[PDB]
Structure formats: structure tokens, C-alpha cells
RNA sequence: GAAACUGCGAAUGGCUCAUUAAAUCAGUUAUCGUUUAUUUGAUAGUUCCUUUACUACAUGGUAUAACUGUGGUAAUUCUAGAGCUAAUACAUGCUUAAAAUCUCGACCCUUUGGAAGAGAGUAUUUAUUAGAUGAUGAUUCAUAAUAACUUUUCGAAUCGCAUGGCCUUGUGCUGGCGAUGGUUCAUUCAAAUUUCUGCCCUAUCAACUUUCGAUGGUAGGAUAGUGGCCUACCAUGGUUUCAACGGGUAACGGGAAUAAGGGUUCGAUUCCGGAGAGGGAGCCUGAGAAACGGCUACCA
């Protein structure tokens, strides 16, 4: 009554049991979408008992992920289900012979499964586009703590 | 030629079905020659 | 760009076809066919600049379009211009009986081996994919975009096939693993012929292989480049620049000159 | 040549963006296809209208502009018939659509209980017409009729919602097919967690 | 051989930055997200079963040119009206000779297997079930089915020599072999995206971007097919001193290898690589054009 309506005009999965599944009275019929994108990253326990129809998941669609895959600090939180990262590196100078800082930004969606939080490290893979910015998406989030300013911090993660 | 199709295609599903089951009978047959010095 | 190229440019045109650059301007382009652009030998450069057979371009489009049928490429009659033959087949000249590999140097060039009218038989493939198609049936495909029917099981999908053209049958095959034969088709180490020493994958999107030899040299390749010449130090061809070995440029000096 | 190239955007940082392509011809863009019903030919005399589009690859792809029947699926019994579908009511995407009766993708539409009331009356013995007459048997039971109860006792608990549906001839069910893309229109039967929900959005809609 | 019919290419280039500070472009993405001639490879028994005068395939129908002519007109790639005839083009089209052909298999009867009597195709739809018992990290993946139900397909009325073997003796074949097809798949053909590094300066750029996109997310719809691309529908987004908004650099735009040391040198006036072919518009081909050099029509 919540996680379906929720304004949303209907959240259904890519495996359409539901309804039906009132055919096998007896064993378990809660399902929901199963995945595992493999790659070495472990499938999120909050995603499969989850509520959540998130089709932009990379566990709960078809969704792929292909080739390259991010590491990155969290800049903002805002937003419904997406975030963006910033990655801090260094370019060199070929006279100067030295280097200066640089920032990507980057466009990442977020599965409800992993819980954000502004400020934390992140991992995101390589999944079909999403949206104007959006390419990335979030597999595997560690937490970090920054005492204020995101911007200020800057590693060479 | 039509004809023909259908009868090289059991031809060759057969004889492949037939070596399948010596195959297996072989498989499972060295199965019992691996585990029986392990006894 | 406007539609799909349909040229190509002598200056562009491959260094594997060891081309006349004065030459002209153009060079035959390879026709869509088994195997890939880069990855080929058209005809008219396999009878002209090779074989020598040919000479002028009309020499060519004599010999390929004359009602007697001069050229067989694995077992078949061709009369196109730039068919590509590609790595491991089998080319005869009927007029001469005349049987070749198609395989790289050492150093990476085209070169054209002699066989046996035993070696004429057997050709070998590399397995590309391996699917169950329609009707419950096993289908396996070669990089000579061979496509198989009902082929023997235990066949993993980077595997080498024995073929024995004359009755289109199999026989032998070998897949690679730590311990085989192999020849390179492409890569800054091409026409190598060594002992799979072992194969680590990524997955990340790209596995890669280490390789032995005559004098014992180190090799690294992606597998995709990776052709199992044969299986358990058995080379299965035989190999053209005597075996597949190449020099230091001080070897070759040291050999021939001898410095 | 209604394109779609993403190059009349403003990047990112929303600064304009230049061109120096003229609209290119692989990124045509179809005029839109809104697709009527014909339960209601107070007009309209030609039932169902479909218009093939010649695609790319050299395909053809056929185009609902107008129809009247589809296809529909009953989820939980696997059985799926040919039908007239009745009125569409919500659409989600918009409530215009509804209101010109168009066919989207996943619109919410009314069908003909006829096949399925046909069919569940014949595997099971029940007609779902008024309630009273329930079930229609055989004479005798010795035979094969000794299976409509095996089946029927499987508790067919067809939810409260399923029931009423049949007798009042209409049935929900939401549609899975691009009108405007293959020309058909299919879809399935509603039951359990949306049934519940968009009957919601109908109760509350209207009261 | 005239001519026509064909059937093909005639989306190729080639000159053109004019733009363009933009991914243009470089790498750097597979594309579970997209399309695919080209090329092979492959390749296709379930089309009736009307309640076999299936007619009977001693393979249909047309339709047409081209063609002979009758012409017209300042005059057309003009065109008229007359007739013709093709056909690898329209338009088809029972596939018998019974009980079609598929799919169990008893059984012996040994093989010739005999097998009883066991049972019976696809483009287009969904809808379920596969899938435990291919594959992925990977799948709702396939390729399965599966029903339905789809003005929807499919399916050589080929020609070419090769017609001498088979039995029959006309016969039945014998089709050989290709030419001439279709089929879907991947087969390169592709593109088409696509991450991941990199244009001049500028903080005297600070802030930016949200009415429909600034974001998310969502309904659809387009899109051939990915995508705010849009329909909505809302999320407020988020970009950013690593200067983000942003500004300013007519900016079209930039591969080889040797080499103790040195010797030297290359690809060849831009490898690379986007945007113009009076103005505008719309349209065109198609596998395949933002079709320059197809149109139109409009303007000039």
C-alpha cells in the first residue's frame, strides 16, 4: 500500500508473478526479481527482501553491467534515486614537468537497497544509459566520514 | 533434395543419439572404476 | 560518413600483403567474406605478388574467370578477385596440384607453406562459439565461420578442431589449457609457435595467456589471439621459416653472416 | 524530420550546445500514432485500422491508429482469448488519453467476460452468471464429470474481485503492446496487488 | 544481337569550414539497450488436412512492354489516342496415388531394421510454463514451448547445362550440377551509440542549471530500435575555486621507425576527424542518405 502506490501510478517487477502466484497455495510465494551481476560483488541482503521496484537496479532488472567500473567520494544526496561523485586526480605538465588537480564528476543511480549518506566512498559499475547523464550505477557503497566540507577533501582514491 | 533434409538430419540425430548412450554408459563406467580403489 | 567504404588505399592496405608502395594508388580490396579484413588474403594478391603465377591485373581475371576452374580454396572452386583466405586454410592450384597453408611468418608476413597431398586433407579450425540451437540440437562455429551440427561434446568453446576436408569429418581436437601447442593469428607477437604455460582471466572484460618455446622465451597474448596449433608439445602443421621461432636481430645476424 | 538527436540540449552545465550537422537522416522521428476504440462506431464504421510503416533494416511495422479488439491473458488460470475490449478508464501517463480512449502501452481497459465465462464453465462446471445457479452439472456421476469437482474444489477461490467482474460482464486488465509499433494490442487480466490498487484510483477517482 | 525487360550501383566520392571551443577529436565504452544488405556459412515434414470433381500442375493467371503502328504540338527526358506481344514482373496457385506426412513403440528380427499400433511447420502478436533442464556476473537470456491470434508471413509455376543410369517396355524416374531464389542466425558490413584521458586564456568566470527538464523518477508515446527525447507526472535535483555558471583563443579542427652515443628519418600540403552544396519547406532511394549533387513546391 506504500512502496506500490506511493503517488507512482503502479510498481510491478520484470517477473510478472504476483496475483498468479496465488495459484501455488503452499510453498513461498513472495517472490521478487533475484540477480547477481557477478563480476565479484557480492548481492545486496536488503536488496532481495526489499519492497522496492526499482527498475534502474542492477539486481532487480535487466539491467547489465559492462566494462568499466568506478570508484569515487559522494558529493550530493539530493535527487531521486541518483548521486554524483566526484574523482580526484592529477594531470601533469609536460613543460613544468609537474601536475595540477583535477575533478570529474560523475552521474551515479543509486538502488534503494544501499543506504547513501553525502560524503562516503562509492562503487560504480558500467550500466546502459540511464538518462541524459546518468551511465553509472551504484554496486557496492562503503561509508567514510569527512568532517564537513565535501568539497575541501580531496584523495587520490 | 526436400527430402533428402529431413532423412541426412535423422541420420545424423540418431548416430549421434547412439553414441551418447556409449559415451555415458562409459562416463558413468569409469565413475565406479574411480571411486572403487578409493574403497 | 556517406554509406558503407567500398576501396581501398595502396598506402592503407595491409603490411601482412608485403605491398609494392610506388605501386599504384589502390589494392584489391578483400571481399566480405570468412575472414576478417586485416585478417586476409585476397586472391589476386595470392597469385600475383605471391605465387607469382599472375603478373598484370588482367592476368588475374584470366585465371579466376576462365571456364577451366584454376584455383580451390579448401575444397572448393572460387573465381572472385579478393576471396580472403584467411589463417590455416587450404589452397590448391588445380592446373599444378598445387596445395598451401595460408599462415603467418615470424616476422608477420603472409607466407604461402607447401603440403602434402596428405596435409591437403586435414585443415584446422578454432572454435569460435558453441550453442544449442533449434529442435534440441548442438551447434558448434569455426573463426572459418564453419558452422557445425551435431559435433562431439566435449568441446569447450575455445577449442581446435582437426578437419578432414575429404569427408567434411572431425577427428581429434584439443582445447588449450596449461601444457599445448599454440600459433598466435595476431598481435605484436604473431607466427609464434610455443607451450601454453597457463591462462589467467579477469573477467573484467579480458583474460590473457603466457607461452614457451625452442629457447625458452617468455610470450603474452590475449586469448583471443591464442590458435592451438595442437595438443601435448605436438605441433599439428608444419610450420613455415622452420619452426615458429623468431630471431633477436642478433640472431639473425649471428646465423646468416654469422657475427 | 522531426529528429531526436540529443544535440539540441544544453550539456550538463546547461551552457548551449553546437551543431555542425544538419539533421541527419538515421534519427528520424515518427509522427506520433494515438490509438481510438471502436466500442463505440457512433461514426466510425471501420472497426480496426492498422497501417504498416516501412523501418529501417527494410522491415515493416505495422500501426494501431484505430481498433475495437485485443487479446487478453487471465494471469492466474494461463488462459488467454481473443476479445472486445469495452471503455478505457485511467491511463496513468495521462488522464487525456482516457478521455479520447487512446491505447497506450499500459493503459487500463474493459473486456468481454464471454470466452473466459465460456471457458472457466467448461473446465470447471461454474458459469459466474447470478450467483444462484452456480454450478451446472451431469446427470450422472460416475464417469469423467467426476473431474469439473477435483478441479473445482481446488478451492477456486477467484478473489471477491474476479467474482463480481464476471457477472457484471465487464473484466480489468491492462494491456502489454505498442499499438503504434506492432498494430496489436495485448493484454492481461488484473487480479491481486494492482486489481486492488487501480480499482482504488476508479473508487476515489469518481466519489 | 537490335529493345526492351530488365536487375543491379548511381546513399559510393569528389571538391567544400562556412560554421564550428563543440568531445569535434583522440584514446577510452559493448551495445542487456540499438540497428544491420554485404558475405558466407547453414538452412525449410509438419501449410490439405475442406467431409483428397485436389480437376488436374501434360508446373496458373494475368497482366505489358518492348514492340507495329495513328499522332499531336514554338517546341520537351513531351506526348496523345491504335494495336500488339513477354516475363526471373503482376497475381496466383492442389502440392496424390490413401486414408498426408509428421511425431511411441510393443514386438521380433535381426535386419532391410521389422517395427505394432503409439501418438502429430514458421515471420505477427500476448499469455503463461520452460529454462530443471544451453549460457552469462550476468536473464524474465535463449530456444524453448504453450495456447491462443494475428487482413501476417513463410514457403523456387526458376532457368542452366549435365539425361544416361535406374525399370518400364512408353514409364517412374534419373537429376547431376550449378543459375535463379527463400529462411532465420552470426557472417564479416556496418553503423550506432558508449564509458574510461585530452581545445587557448579567464575568478576581474562564484556560482550554475529546474515550467515541463535542471535533476530523479515514472506513464506513454514516439522513435527501427537506447535515451527528458518528448507525453505527462511529480521528485527537487544536482553542476561547481580541481573555478564550475561561466566567460575570452575564426577553432573547422590534428599516424613510422630506428635508434652505445650519434646515424637518421618516415607515413607523404591534417593518418585523424565533425559541418555546404540559392533561400526556405517538405518530402526521394533504400540493407542502406538528414540524399547536395532525388525530387517537389515555395521563394528568389
Known amino acids: ?157 | 533434395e526436400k527430402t533428402q533434409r529431413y532423412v541426412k538430419t535423422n541420420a545424423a540425430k540418431e548416430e549421434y543419439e547412439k553414441f551418447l548412450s556409449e559415451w555415458k554408459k562409459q562416463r558413468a563406467a569409469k565413475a565406479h572404476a574411480a571411486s572403487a580403489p578409493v574403497v | 560518413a556517406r554509406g558503407p567504404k567500398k576501396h581501398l588505399k595502396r598506402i592503407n592496405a595491409p603490411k601482412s600483403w608485403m605491398l609494392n608502395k610506388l605501386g599504384g594508388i589502390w589494392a584489391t580490396r578483400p571481399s566480405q567474406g570468412p575472414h576478417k579484413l586485416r585478417e586476409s588474403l585476397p586472391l589476386s594478391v595470392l597469385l600475383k605478388e605471391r605465387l607469382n603465377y599472375a603478373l598484370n591485373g588482367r592476368d588475374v581475371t584470366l585465371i579466376l574467370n576462365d571456364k577451366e576452374q584454376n584455383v580451390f580454396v579448401d575444397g572448393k572452386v572460387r573465381r572472385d578477385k579478393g576471396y580472403p583466405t584467411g589463417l590455416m586454410d587450404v589452397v590448391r592450384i588445380e592446373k599444378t596440384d598445387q596445395s598451401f597453408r595460408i599462415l603467418y611468418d615470424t616476422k608477420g608476413r603472409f607466407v604461402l607453406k607447401s603440403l602434402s597431398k596428405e596435409e591437403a586433407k586435414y585443415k584446422l579450425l578454432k572454435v569460435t562459439a558453441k550453442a544449442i540451437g533449434p529442435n534440441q540440437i548442438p551447434y558448434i562455429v569455426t573463426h572459418d565461420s564453419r558452422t557445425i551440427r551435431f559435433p562431439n561434446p566435449e568441446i569447450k568453446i575455445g577449442d581446435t578442431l582437426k578437419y578432414d576436408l575429404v569427408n567434411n569429418k572431425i577427428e581429434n581436437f584439443a582445447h588449450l589449457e596449461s601444457g599445448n601447442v599454440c600459433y598466435i593469428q595476431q598481435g605484436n607477437n604473431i607466427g609464434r609457435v610455443g607451450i601454453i604455460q597457463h591462462i589467467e582471466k579477469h573477467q573484467g572484460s579480458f583474460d590473457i595467456c603466457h607461452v614457451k618455446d625452442a629457447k625458452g622465451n617468455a610470450f603474452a597474448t590475449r586469448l583471443g589471439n591464442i590458435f592451438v596449433l595442437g595438443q601435448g608439445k605436438k605441433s599439428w602443421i608444419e610450420l613455415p621459416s622452420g619452426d615458429g621461432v623468431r630471431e633477436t636481430i642478433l640472431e639473425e645476424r649471428k646465423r646468416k653472416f654469422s657475427y | 524530420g522531426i529528429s531526436r538527436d540529443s544535440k539540441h540540449k544544453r550539456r550538463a552545465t546547461g551552457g548551449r550546445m553546437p551543431v555542425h550537422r544538419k539533421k541527419r537522416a538515421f534519427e528520424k522521428g515518427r509522427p506520433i500514432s494515438m490509438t481510438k476504440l471502436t466500442t463505440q462506431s457512433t461514426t466510425i464504421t471501420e472497426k480496426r485500422r492498422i497501417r504498416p510503416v516501412r523501418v529501417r533494416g527494410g522491415h515493416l511495422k505495422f500501426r494501431a491508429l484505430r481498433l475495437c479488439e485485443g487479446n487478453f491473458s487471465w494471469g492466474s488460470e494461463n488462459i488467454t482469448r481473443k476479445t472486445k475490449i469495452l471503455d478505457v478508464k485511467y491511463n496513468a501517463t495521462n488522464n487525456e488519453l482516457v478521455r479520447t480512449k487512446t491505447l497506450v502501452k499500459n493503459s487500463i481497459v474493459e473486456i468481454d467476460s464471454t470466452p473466459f465465462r465460456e471457458w472457466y464453465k467448461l473446465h470447471y462446471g461454474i458459469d459466474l452468471g447470478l450467483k444462484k445457479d452456480r454450478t451446472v452439472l451431469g446427470n450422472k456421476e460416475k464417469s469423467r464429470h467426476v473431474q469439473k469437482r477435483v478441479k473445482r474444489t481446488k478451492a477456486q477461490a477467484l478473489e471477491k474481485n474476479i467474482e463480481e467482474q464476471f457477472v457484471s460482464q465487464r473484466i480489468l486488465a491492462c494491456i502489454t503492446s505498442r499499438p503504434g509499433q506492432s498494430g496489436r494490442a495485448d493484454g492481461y487480466i488484473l487480479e491481486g496487488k494492482e486489481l486492488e490498487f487501480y480499482i482504488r484510483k476508479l473508487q476515489s477517482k469518481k466519489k
Open chain 1, 1 to 157: 500500500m506504500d512502496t506500490q502506490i506511493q503517488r507512482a501510478y503502479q510498481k510491478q517487477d520484470g517477473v510478472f508473478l504476483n496475483s498468479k502466484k496465488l495459484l501455488a497455495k503452499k510453498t513461498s510465494a513472495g517472490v521478487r526479481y533475484y540477480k547477481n551481476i557477478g563480476l565479484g560483488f557480492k548481492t545486496p541482503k536488503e536488496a532481495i527482501e526489499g519492497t522496492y521496484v526499482d527498475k534502474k537496479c542492477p539486481f532487480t532488472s535487466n539491467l547489465s553491467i559492462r566494462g568499466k567500473i568506478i570508484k569515487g567520494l559522494v558529493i550530493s544526496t539530493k535527487m531521486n534515486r541518483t548521486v554524483i561523485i566526484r574523482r580526484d586526480y592529477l594531470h601533469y605538465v609536460r613543460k613544468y614537468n609537474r601536475y595540477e588537480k583535477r575533478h570529474r564528476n560523475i552521474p551515479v543511480h543509486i538502488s534503494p537497497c544501499f543506504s547513501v549518506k553525502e560524503g562516503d566512498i562509492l562503487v560504480a559499475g558500467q550500466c546502459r544509459p540511464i538518462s541524459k547523464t546518468v551511465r553509472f550505477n551504484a554496486l557496492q557503497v562503503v561509508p567514510n566520514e569527512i568532517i564537513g566540507s565535501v568539497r575541501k577533501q580531496f584523495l587520490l582514491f
